[PDB]
Symmetry: C3
Subunit: 28 residues, 3 copies
């Protein structure tokens, strides 16, 4: 359970990073 | 604690999916 | 492990809210 929670949170982080990259290009 | 963590991640994933739609709508 | 997970989710929630506001300002 704990390892799956770490696994899912890390995937959210890289999903957050792509969202911030998308917004930065939109505002360009 | 573990059950609340799982729910928070599940709620976060649904917010991520809606954010992606808002960004895709902006690109249209 | 439990502390890092809860402190990582709290940071992700702050990012989600800022992303939602950034997207809302884009739609303005
Ligand atoms: Cl387990
Ligand atoms: Cl584990
Ligand atoms: Cl507990
Ligand atoms: Cl529990
Ligand atoms: Cl620990
Ligand atoms: Cl802990
Ligand atoms: Cu489509
Ligand atoms: Cu409002």
């Amino acid at each position: 359970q704990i390892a799956a929670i770490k696994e899912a949170i890390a995937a959210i982080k890289q999903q957050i990073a792509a969202i911030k990259x998308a917004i930065a290009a939109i505002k360009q």
